[PDB]
């Protein structure tokens, strides 16, 4: 119903003829009756009622913050109530006061400088933008232009600007309130009058942010970390439920619906959310995606997401309305109980998150390759793994906030946002230059930390303005290689991700690969493992070489034996990690950590105090462990062998190397995983010796595709089995013997 | 133990300075007294024993072709034997009679031109080499002068010239005996004398035969159809044991062992062998792969190559010496009938072979899309389908001799070679020409005939020389898109092959694809069904489009009904399509044969009736279907249903054909497949309904890769399924409802 027409090259709807358009349209004006006597959305009415009054004076904060604005009160309450009753009841008069009320306040309301200050200046536009919709019939041609003019004045004091030409479209606070809500917004309700404002508005939002947006939605994630998918993915999700509104339909690539399923998977027994990206901790309240679970599920009419919307049925007072205008009622909800144990995120991501049931006894684990980086809240984690039971055995390391201050401190530019505060792999050029020129918006550096790992890509640690700039530039940091899940996709044995993160890196490195291989064992005991074996290939043998594996706790050293407890809020997770490779001959295993070494970063400490009362756990970490070659060579071989069970559990499994013919592998208790020896493409025969008593699951992977013949003891035991192109990879069981492999 | 020197950027091995390393080195010599005591090899001696008599003057043929020779009789068996016991014994002068019983004859033979002589030239060569080498040490050296001298003279004879510059390395005659066995041989003899000889053949194996074979070698085919086959790979494998015995290990992709697993899928219970590019039939006698099986099964250890050499134990003469020293008697055999019921050829074939069993009830069916050509003996048959039951039914049309001629006939240039002799797509330009100049060897023609089929590729229809050629020119023919089988590897019920062939043709298209769907019904009245999904694009929409399908017997048509069935030779199987894309209003069905239109090309029949005593079952074929559109359009699609079973079988199943959203499927017996209505990737949700009692086996094709949501009567059904990269396909059971899927 509504027209679409090319603008320079790029498709686009043209707002229609009609009011209202914003929100809604005169086909869903007698449906509010009904929601009105849904008793399910009379308390979010009676909710409103009670936002008409306005601040007690003995309330309102020195520093009138973006939070005091979001919690909405008093005048603009009032006058979008009263809007809103101008929109069922076409009583003159009542659209007649709520034009009155506004349009002094609104042409003539100052803002002071303070925290994310745009946010209330957009919602203080948006009031403006339901008045003018929904009571333009009312409207005079005088009050018309004062609304206009009050709304570019408005519009000029955003971050973004008027022109909105400044900022990012992928990222930042230009991937927020502002375009996505705030000016689409009041572009759709003045276009007649004004059509220069959605034109830019939505001209934008479809150049550049919907083009971004579409490209990496297929692949069912979200790039800014496990705290800023709100206000991201909710922004992302006003577009959706605008556009649609007006009239043009679902402009989003339908994968959108899937998006927040990771932070299902993500959700661990104690109401908190596994960490990645710009976070921060806490153990008191479960962590929520109110927002974007309601927006979403609502919309697709998805009963998962719908699920995690009722945990928490509360969204902040300046969002009630949209909850009344388009929260689904009648939707049913479901628990994520029966979605399979793992699942796979693929271009541009890479990203597997492996479970072991969704009850309080869940392993949660997450492998990761990254083949882009978008930067801002995202963090050089290619490569890193993350591990969860009873407690963050394996964790992604830091905090977003503490002494060292907010997204600017001299702790986010030299340890979190960094390779060194993962689970990933380090590589020490003394020479090497990081050039973070353009991070942040103030306490701007030039340089930054030298950890020894990935590059900072974009004009010196800075994201692109839009994919067209991004696909041109150096944010490209790997490429997905091999992936799958064990035999049945809904409880699977295995779950394979490999990645080669060599562009991630600087000249420094010729090759860096690296396989994951998490095991559900399906035991009691010990219920998971997982195998990680990585290639590195220095460009100058003199480069030292670190694994690292971060905890909270300090790590117990035995050998070739790391230990890891939870002993502390409850948990009592453990993790042990059997290092394989480089030989006993060749590790040399060392700890660092504890006060004054717990953000350690090569000569200084970066140190970041929790604030008072907050992450009770110290899931920032206080210590990691460094594996190391003591040969300096161009070329090593990481291997190493972590299993999971509770802190109780004394006798864990025998990890045994398997040493074969162009193959390198993995034995405990009935699982054999074989890698190539070189982790290239095994395209010729093979073999290996296995000893044990009873069944095996096999999985061989790094083979080329294609038919594969299996002998055990010079006998045929499989004659013709088929590796797949996706895993490169042969499953199947057999028992112990001496097998061959031919191709 | 040899030295390998580079020769012009490829590495070739050096002759081991000592003697003999001839088929065998020194270490081998003592176990000839072993293989001599062998109960089974000493009727293999006993033979050649026989071959030293001469041939009765009556018998003698005086015109005499390669047969005369190859059926090796008197001197030459003679020397080889003297030269044998000379290894044995190292009694002085029978190394002496060895040599002067050969070197005047060498000297001074003569070769009448006659049908394919230069094996015969070659053999002497051979039996030359033979006394050179394993006699070395009794040579004088003005003898070795002579002998050098005598083997230029008669290399010189050889199409292949010497220098070998002449004719083809990947088909040809020099893809057979000539360099493979012959020149190599010599050269490998008289390397310390005249290197050059060496230098240039296995210069030319090495830079050329080796390189072709490697390339194609790991998808386990060859290209050359189902009777050349025999000659073709032999010679490969002849050069595997010759370079092997003088110790250069296996200089060929080890893959080589199962390329004979293909012969081994396509065997018939009559004992043929499906048909596939250049073949003739019998009933008579069966095909065995005798020597193939003998040299792959003996050096790979291949119980199932060795099974199908003892079905027929019997060598051809000249190759009795080579059995006696290379045939491994101990290793053991087995039959097929534990082998996957379906296999997959990749890269650069694409084709898949399918069954039902291994036995006299199963359906055996093969589908192509060939992503190159190699000419010479193989067809223009991008797309072709093949189906045997109880007899051939769906067919692969013509025959290479008979009453037309040989190679060079009209049949072949003008139907058997050609798409219109396969169950392939035609589409017609009235001005298109296939030039064929190149073509064969005698009797060359400029044109051939306008069939509405695929490009005669190369320069005049004639094969590259080697690799290098064949990228760099026009003998691409198609790109695999998708393929798999399933669920299970043994016994799929399902088997999955698409293609995009487009290249196969002319410009006169801009876009064809086709997919196979071949279903092992896993049912008592109807084994099998087989479906065919075409898009076809023509350049100009008046360009008349046909779908194919040749049988035996004359096919009745009734409605959108096809009935083939046999009823001679024993044959009793039925085939049945249903027509359900062009529909009614925009389909004519039309059969064309009987005599005078067996071979009909738009204007002329090009006859070919069988040679007297021969293809007793008529396999050549009679008959043909054509579907065309009713209407002139650019675009077109052909879905078509075959069902497989007895011909007294009289209710088969209903085939119904789904009309969804963005997808178009078949519903017959338990079995539910769809694909893309474009045949291009669905990357949206779609749907359909299904009505039915039971449950169905649902396959999904054309599918984007990732994680899909399927959901019935608007419920979840399964939360999360994966379509993989190899296949775009989903496979779930489920029960009637309205079907949405959701990416
Ligand atoms: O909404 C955000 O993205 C966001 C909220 C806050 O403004 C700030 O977090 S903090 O209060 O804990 O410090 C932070 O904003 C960043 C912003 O993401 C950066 N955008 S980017 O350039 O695209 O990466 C940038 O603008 O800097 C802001 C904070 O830096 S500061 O103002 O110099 O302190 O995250
Ligand atoms: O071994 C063969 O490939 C082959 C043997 C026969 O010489 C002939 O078969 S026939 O007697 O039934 O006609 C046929 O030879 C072909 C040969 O394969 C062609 N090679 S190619 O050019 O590389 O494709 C070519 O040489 O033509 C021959 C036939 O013409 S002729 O030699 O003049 O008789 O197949
Ligand atoms: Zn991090
Ligand atoms: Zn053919």
């Known amino acids: 119903d509504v027209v679409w027409k090319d603008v320079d090259g790029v498709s686009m709807p043209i707002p229609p003829k009609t009011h209202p358009r914003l929100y809604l349209r005169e086909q869903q004006v007698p449906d509010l009756k009904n929601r009105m006597n849904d008793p399910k959305l009379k308390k979010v009415w009676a909710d409103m009622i009670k936002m008409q009054e306005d601040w007690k004076p003995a309330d309102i904060p020195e520093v009138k913050d973006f939070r005091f604005y979001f919690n909405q009160k008093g005048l603009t309450v009032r006058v979008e109530l009263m809007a809103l009753n101008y929109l069922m009841t076409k009583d003159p008069k009542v659209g007649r006061e709520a034009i009155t009320s506004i349009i002094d306040t609104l042409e003539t309301a100052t803002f002071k400088p303070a925290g994310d200050i745009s946010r209330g200046i ?12 929904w009571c333009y019939d009312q409207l005079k041609p005088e009050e018309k232009t004062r609304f206009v003019k009050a709304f570019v004045r408005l519009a000029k004091m955003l971050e973004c600007g008027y022109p909105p030409v400044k900022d990012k479209s992928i990222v930042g606070h230009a991937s927020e309130w502002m375009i996505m809500r705030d000016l689409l917004s009041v572009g759709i309700a003045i276009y007649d009058e004004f059509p220069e404002m959605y034109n830019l508005a939505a001209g934008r939002f479809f150049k550049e942010h919907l083009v971004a947006r579409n490209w990496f939605y297929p692949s069912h994630n979200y790039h800014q970390g496990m705290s800023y998918l709100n206000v991201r993915f909710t922004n992302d999700l006003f577009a959706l439920w605008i556009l649609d509104r007006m009239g043009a339909g679902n402009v989003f690539n339908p994968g959108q ?4 399923y990771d932070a299902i998977y993500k959700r661990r027994p104690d109401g908190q959310i596994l960490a990645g990206g710009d976070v921060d901790y806490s153990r008191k309240k479960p962590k929520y995606y109110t927002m974007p679970a309601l927006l979403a599920g609502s ?27 388009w929260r689904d009622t009648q939707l049913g909800s479901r628990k994520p109980d029966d979605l399979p144990l793992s699942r796979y995120s693929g271009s541009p991501f890479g990203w597997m998150i492996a479970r072991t049931g969704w009850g309080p006894e869940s392993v ?9 980086s978008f930067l801002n809240h995202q963090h050089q984690d290619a490569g890193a793994f993350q591990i969860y039971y009873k407690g963050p055995l394996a964790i992604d390391a830091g905090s977003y906030t503490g002494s060292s201050g907010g997204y600017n401190s001299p702790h986010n530019k030299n340890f979190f946002k960094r390779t060194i505060a993962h689970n990933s792999l380090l590589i020490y050029d003394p020479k090497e230059t990081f050039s973070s020129s353009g991070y942040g918006g103030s306490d701007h550096t030039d340089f930054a930390a030298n950890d020894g790992g990935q590059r900072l890509p974009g004009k010196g640690w800075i994201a692109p303005r839009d994919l067209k700039e991004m696909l041109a530039g150096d944010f490209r940091t790997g490429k997905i290689l091999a992936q799958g899940f064990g035999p049945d996709n809904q409880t699977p044995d295995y779950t394979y991700l490999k ?15 690296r396989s994951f291989l998490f095991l559900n064992l399906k035991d009691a005991k010990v219920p998971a493992a997982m195998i990680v074996f990585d290639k590195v290939v220095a460009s100058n043998p003199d480069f030292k070489k670190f694994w690292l594996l ?35 001959a060749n590790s040399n295993i060392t700890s660092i950590g504890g006060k004054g070494k717990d953000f350690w970063v090569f000569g200084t400490n970066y140190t970041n105090d929790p604030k008072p009362g907050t992450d009770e756990a110290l899931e920032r970490g206080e ?9 300096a060579a161009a070329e090593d071989y990481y291997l190493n062998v972590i299993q999971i069970a509770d802190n109780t559990q004394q006798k864990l499994h025998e990890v045994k190397r398997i040493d074969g013919d162009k193959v390198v592998g993995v034995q405990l208790a009935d699982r054999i995983v074989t890698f190539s020896k070189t982790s290239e493409t095994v395209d010729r025969p093979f073999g290996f010796s296995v000893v044990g008593k009873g069944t095996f699951k096999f999985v061989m992977t790094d083979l080329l595709p294609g038919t594969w013949q299996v002998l055990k003891d010079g006998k045929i035991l499989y004659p013709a089995l088929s590796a797949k192109g996706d895993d490169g990879a042969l499953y199947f069981e057999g028992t112990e013997g001496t097998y061959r492999f031919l191709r």
């Open 122 to 133: 957009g919602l203080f536009m948006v009031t403006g933008a339901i008045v003018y919709d």
């Open 257 to 260: 619906q899937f998006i927040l």
């Open 299 to 325: 919309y697709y009419k998805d009963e998962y997401l719908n699920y995690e919307f009722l945990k928490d049925p509360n969204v902040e007072p300046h969002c009630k309305l949209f909850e009344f205008l």
């Open 364 to 372: 949660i684990a997450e492998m990761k390759v990254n083949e882009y």
């Open 499 to 513: 990645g080669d993160i060599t562009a991630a890196y600087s000249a420094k490195v010729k090759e860096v690969k």
């Open 550 to 584: 971060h905890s909270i706790e300090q790590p117990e050293i035995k050998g070739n034996q790391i230990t890891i407890k939870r002993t502390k809020n409850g948990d009592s997770g453990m993790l042990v990690n059997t290092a394989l490779l480089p030989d006993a």
């Open 623 to 631: 210590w990691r462990v460094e594996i190391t070659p003591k040969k």
